[PDB]
Amino acid sequence: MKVIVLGSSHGGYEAVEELLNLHPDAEIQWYEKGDFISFLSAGMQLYLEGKVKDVNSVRYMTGEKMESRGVNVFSNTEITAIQPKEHQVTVKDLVSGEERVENYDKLIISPGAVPFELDIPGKDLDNIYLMRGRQWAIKLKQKTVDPEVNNVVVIGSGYIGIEAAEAFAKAGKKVTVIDILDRPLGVYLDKEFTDVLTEEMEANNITIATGETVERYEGDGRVQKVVTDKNAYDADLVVVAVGVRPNTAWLKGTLELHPNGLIKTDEYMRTSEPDVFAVGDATLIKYNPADTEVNIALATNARKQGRFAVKNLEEPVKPFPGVQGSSGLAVFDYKFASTGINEVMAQKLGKETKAVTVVEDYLMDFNPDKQKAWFKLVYDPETTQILGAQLMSKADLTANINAISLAIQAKMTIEDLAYADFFFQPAFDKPWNIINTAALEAVKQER
Numbered sequence: 066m067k068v069i070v071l072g073s074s075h076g077g078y079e080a081v082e083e084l085l086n087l088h089p090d091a092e093i094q095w096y097e098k099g100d101f102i103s104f105l106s107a108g109m110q111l112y113l114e115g116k117v118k119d120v121n122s123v124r125y126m127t128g129e130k131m132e133s134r135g136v137n138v139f140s141n142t143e144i145t146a147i148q149p150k151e152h153q154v155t156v157k158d159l160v161s162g163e164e165r166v167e168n169y170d171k172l173i174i175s176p177g178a179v180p181f182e183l184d185i186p187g188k189d190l191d192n193i194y195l196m197r198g199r200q201w202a203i204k205l206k207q208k209t210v211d212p213e214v215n216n217v218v219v220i221g222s223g224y225i226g227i228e229a230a231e232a233f234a235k236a237g238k239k240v241t242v243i244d245i246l247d248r249p250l251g252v253y254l255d256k257e258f259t260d261v262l263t264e265e266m267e268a269n270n271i272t273i274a275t276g277e278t279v280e281r282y283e284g285d286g287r288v289q290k291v292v293t294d295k296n297a298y299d300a301d302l303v304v305v306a307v308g309v310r311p312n313t314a315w316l317k318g319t320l321e322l323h324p325n326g327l328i329k330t331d332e333y334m335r336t337s338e339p340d341v342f343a344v345g346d347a348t349l350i351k352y353n354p355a356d357t358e359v360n361i362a363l364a365t366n367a368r369k370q371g372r373f374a375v376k377n378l379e380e381p382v383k384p385f386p387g388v389q390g391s392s393g394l395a396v397f398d399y400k401f402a403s404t405g406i407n408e409v410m411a412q413k414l415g416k417e418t419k420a421v422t423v424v425e426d427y428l429m430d431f432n433p434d435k436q437k438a439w440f441k442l443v444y445d446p447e448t449t450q451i452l453g454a455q456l457m458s459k460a461d462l463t464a465n466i467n468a469i470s471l472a473i474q475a476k477m478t479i480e481d482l483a484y485a486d487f488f489f490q491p492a493f494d495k496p497w498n499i500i501n502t503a504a505l506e507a508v509k510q511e512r
């Protein structure tokens with residue numbers, strides 16, 4: 066059986082891993098149009114902050130290692146088109162210019178996504194940077210030590226924008242974050258959490274300019290000003306982290322796509338055409354909190370989809386279990402994690418919810434290491450089933466969100482979590498831990 070896998074990132078990589086243990090016998094070709102196999106864009110912040118010194122070690126696989134396992138790796142080779150009926154792809158070797166047609170028995174594609182750019186006046190004056198991949202990582206790192214860069218503006222206040230804002234504020238630069246949305250990180254956290262984080266960022270000289278539409282970049286040759294409908298900001302560097310666009314335009318007319326460019330797939334990762342599977346940021350995934358399909362562009366999602374595509378290679382036998390959208394990050398001293406439905410998700414999906422937020426020390430009063438922790442539990446008003454949770458503290462309590470992700474998947478209720486058995490030892494927690502305490506509050510609220 067000959068299987069071709071497109072993409073060396075999270076989705077494509079895991080499909081190769083599951084093929085190696087489920088179909089050791091197969092001829093496997095792995096294609097990457099880029100020069101570098103499996104660079105980890107998630108590790109970019111650690112590199113930019115100087116935690117990791119070698120940009121080339123921020124990866125999880127090399128072509129050499131895969132070839133030792135019998136995989137045919139083709140870097141600098143792009144799959145230009147798919148001919149689904151006759152089961153062929155045309156590939157182009159980007160270093161020699163040679164094209165060729167390759168046949169396959171099964172095709173798994175994980176084409177990914179590309180940074181969204183603002184198509185506005187000034188669009189590409191110099192020093193308007195993006196944040197994805199090895200080349201952008203290197204360029205961003207050189208700007209971190211440049212004495213000419215004094216003011217940097219990042220557009221977008223989501224996960225990637227706040228990572229870039231923290232990295233340049235730690236490098237000693239003045240940062241302004243601009244967005245149309247009213248709160249940074251609203252897709253991940255609710256207002257009681259983002260109010261605390263806004264203060265922490267402002268204490269580290271990051272200005273957050275919310276509710277402003279960027280209209281043009283101004284500058285002579287290189288960017289010098291970012292002007293919005295409401296203001297003008299000096300900028301020596303702009304990082305655009307507004308969002309991501311599916312890399313699927315080349316597939317229009319070949320595979321069925323959603324209006325927004327996402328590939329249509331079912332619960333077995335099958336596309337509209339026989340024997341081609343699609344995985345990763347370019348697809349929608351089953352979202353268990355609301356029993357619907359949502360696009361959640363995370364490495365965890367792409368890796369699970371990748372393995373499920375190989376499981377369903379010959380027969381639709383293993384439907385995808387679904388996910389909860391779990392994410393976590395540190396912003397200066399605060400470490401937060403969240404899963405399931407929050408206010409922005411509930412609004413987008415038209416979902417009614419109830420919630421309780423508990424803010425108190427996570428260790429007993431006599432223990433001098435005690436610190437404040439914020440925990441919000443979101444539940445369904447009719448069934449009281451768990452729908453989401455968010456937590457934050459300067460102490461790392463993030464592994465507790467893993468228990469809430471399972472609770473949502475299992476359809477547990479506030480009563481189940483109020484009395485769930487979690488260990489107690491006073492150097493680690495209180496007799497009723499952070500999850501028990503918030504659920505106990507919800508039980509009182511619903512009496």
Ligand SMILES: Cc1cc2nc3c(=O)[nH]c(=O)nc-3n(C[C@H](O)[C@H](O)[C@H](O)COP(=O)(O)OP(=O)(O)OC[C@H]3O[C@@H](n4cnc5c(N)ncnc54)[C@H](O)[C@@H]3O)c2cc1C
Binds near residue numbers: 175
């Ligand atoms: C700065 C940053 C930080 C992130 N941090 C986290 C995090 O901490 N936790 C988390 O879970 N997720 C994180 N993510 C998200 C995560 O990186 C993505 O969800 C994941 O990489 C998606 O994998 P993918 O295979 O779908 O696509 P992509 O990563 O977009 O990879 C697509 C690959 O296929 C190649 N390709 C595309 N078309 C072709 C073609 N036609 N022929 C051959 N090759 C082709 C591309 O060159 C690319 O290498 C982060 C993303 C960024 C940018």
